[PDB]
Amino acid sequence: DSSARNEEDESCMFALKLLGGFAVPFTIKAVIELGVMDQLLTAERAMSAEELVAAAVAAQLPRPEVACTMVDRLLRFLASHSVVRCTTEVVVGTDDATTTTCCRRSYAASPVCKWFARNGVEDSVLPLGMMILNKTFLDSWQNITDAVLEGAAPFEKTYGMPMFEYLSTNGPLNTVFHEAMANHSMIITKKLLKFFRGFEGLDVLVDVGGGNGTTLQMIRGQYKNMRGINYDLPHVIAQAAPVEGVEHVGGSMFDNIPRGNAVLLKWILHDWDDKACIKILKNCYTALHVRGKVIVLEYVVPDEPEPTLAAQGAFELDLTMLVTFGSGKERTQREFSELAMEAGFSREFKATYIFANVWALEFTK
Amino acid sequence: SARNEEDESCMFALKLLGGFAVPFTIKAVIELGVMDQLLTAERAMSAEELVAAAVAAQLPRPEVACTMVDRLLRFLASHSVVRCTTEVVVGTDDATTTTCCRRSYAASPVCKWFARNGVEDSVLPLGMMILNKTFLDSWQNITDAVLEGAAPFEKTYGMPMFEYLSTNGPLNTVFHEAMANHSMIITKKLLKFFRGFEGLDVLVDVGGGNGTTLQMIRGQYKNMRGINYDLPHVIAQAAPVEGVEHVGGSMFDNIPRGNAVLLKWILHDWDDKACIKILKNCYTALHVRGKVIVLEYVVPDEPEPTLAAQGAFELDLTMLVTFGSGKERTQREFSELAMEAGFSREFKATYIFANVWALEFTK
Ligand SMILES: Oc1ccc(/C=C/c2cc(O)cc(O)c2)cc1
Ligand SMILES: Oc1ccc(/C=C/c2cc(O)cc(O)c2)cc1
């Protein structure tokens, strides 16, 4: 039934592929939580499931042969998606701890897997991953329907309150959230220092929502004669250590913003609707002197839904903001400029690509 | 360059970690009625249009619902699930999320497989089970399950799936509707492309429900009788069907006699040992020159990075989550089950559709 038959078959499978695209993520999580991913990353040869379970899991196992075959099957699936490399050797006996009698598979990390390193943020996005895949946020996403009808945030529909509020009532999730944001912050700020030339010759710099990894410490680190101001809410500022060259200030960014030669908003704007954003940015306008600058660290969705990896990641972030916040959202270049102009800024705009979909966007007074 | 490589690699990592987003966005688009509307629409349609058409319910904040739906479809479009065309607005539209720009959306070919009112060529019922939160919650318990060498389903709910289905009518319905769904499609393609029902006097379907499947088949081979074997609970609720005797019993005890036995999505539920019990019972059941016909995916011998391979290893993992020792099998492994259970070193494989093969073993 030549070619018609295959088209139909391909299409059906593509349907199924889309409906099951969660499998990859959830299998990655489980391979990380077993320590099997860390072992891949420390390895200098390919390693079988048996070898990797013995290395990753110190504990006596109640059914060790089954835990091995299960890990084998998980890694076989990842391998089919190019997450791990897989090689196959002949028996010489009968080994029971692979899912195939004839043939033992041995696995090695792909380049990408380094970004799942547990040890430390030595170039890892794992703590961020731990948040992306936490029960609490994933439950929200399964409840978008009812949230859309109500015109509400799925988070809130599902937990009966705004995520931020929720975080103060649940320390475990709070920890996860702050660790994710510190994670992202660290990678981004490191890259900023390599690629971005907007911090030079600035006498004061205000960081909004930071303090504690500060980020200003890292920056001030490379601009010794730059002073910093760490603006965030009082609850958060009441927990800040005195830091060399950094004033900590407490207060709400909707009410006021401290004066500097530049202000920094990393992953702030995208949490809020245009109306709330314009309140915020106005407060930055009144803070700033003329010739000064707001520096915005955000993704920038393209004007159109292009099928590129970069684009897809940005629209995905958009949907995370949707789920998390509702009216929080990702923005185009154009859309950001329009916010800046409402809030008083001139028609002078700078955009510099940093890393991992994040741009530094600068508005001047 | 190693700045660019590093960039790409990082974004790759984030892609991998967030690939549930597509499925869950599709689910929502389906439950809103919006996907059905795309599928019936004559031209591209905006979010506003689609919400007005799909949603009967009084909307407390209609402009927000519309922008939310726009954003969903903008994301699907970036993944080639919907087609998206963008126009300049000459006025104030706040029911799409961009001031400058209204988008309009149309179905991609793929979307027909999400059609409601289930008809001919839809896998939606099966989709609704793939994405059911009862089933999906098990995938959050793989770590601890592996350690104990348990099935994540049981780790999560404290008993095997089939027993669990007796407790939850709603999920039972989901599961039955899904299996009937896929069985219907697969049976239709079988009747087109498979010749192994020619010349069979009796066919025994094991775990085929209300006999729908035997009905469809018998419909094209009128001189073929069927026997519908399943548990008594399942059978005592199954409607009379012309030319089909319904038999109640366990396939672990025995199997009614015939010329062939059908096993659709049975074997992959079970470990090697249980499968060999079942196949042995089939061997004794069959009169000589009889066959088992196995309708299952067939994993390749190696994790090849192909769309087909991926979908079979994905099914493998579903078995792993659902049953633990349930599993997908290579040709070679199927053959070894057949040889343990007494069948000859003789094996026939016919591709059907959607990664499913008809594998035949001869007594
Ligand atoms: O792409 C697909 C993804 C998932 C499935 C599920 C199949 C399935 C089959 C069973 O016999 C039991 C079960 O609990 C699940 C099929 C196709
Ligand atoms: O691949 C991904 C890349 C980045 C993110 C970021 C998420 C995020 C979530 C929030 O609740 C607040 C926030 O300010 C950021 C999630 C997935």
Author numbering:
A (entry chain D): 13 to 377
B (entry chain B): 15 to 377
Task: Quote the study's own text.
A stilbene O-methyltransferase, SbSOMT, is first shown to be indispensable for pathogen-inducible pterostilbene (3,5-bis-O-methylated) biosynthesis in sorghum (Sorghum bicolor). Phylogenetic analysis indicates the recruitment of genus-specific SOMTs from canonical caffeic acid O-methyltransferases (COMTs) after the divergence of Sorghum spp. from Saccharum spp. In recombinant enzyme assays, SbSOMT and COMTs regioselectively catalyze O-methylation of stilbene A-ring and B-ring respectively. Whilst SbSOMT shows global structural resemblance to SbCOMT, molecular characterizations illustrate two hydrophobic residues (Ile144/Phe337) crucial for substrate binding orientation leading to 3,5-bis-O-methylations in the A-ring. The catalytic residues of SbSOMT are highly conserved with all reported COMTs, including His282 as the key nucleophile, whereas Asp283, Glu310, and Glu342 collectively charge the basicity or confine His282 in its reactive conformation.
To rationalize their different catalytic regioselectivities, structural analyses involving X-ray crystallography and computational methods were conducted. We solved the crystal structure of an SbSOMT-resveratrol-nicotinamide adenine dinucleotide (β-NAD) ternary complex (diffracted to 1.72 Å resolution, Fig. 4d; β-NAD was utilized as an additive to improve crystallization), an SbSOMT-resveratrol binary complex, and two ternary complexes reproduced with pinostilbene or pterostilbene (diffracted at 2.10 and 2.56 Å, respectively). All complexes were in high structural resemblance and depicted as a homodimer with an open conformation. Of the three hydroxyl groups on resveratrol capable of forming hydrogen bonds, only the methyl-accepting 3-OH group (A-ring) formed direct hydrogen bonds to SbSOMT residues, including the catalytic residues His282 (2.80 Å) and Asp283 (3.26 Å). Other hydroxyl groups were shielded by water molecules and did not directly interact with SbSOMT. Overall, these structures depicted a productive substrate orientation within the substrate binding pocket which greatly favors A-ring O-methylation. So far, our results revealed that SbSOMT catalyzes the 3,5-bis-O-methylation of resveratrol upon fungal infection.
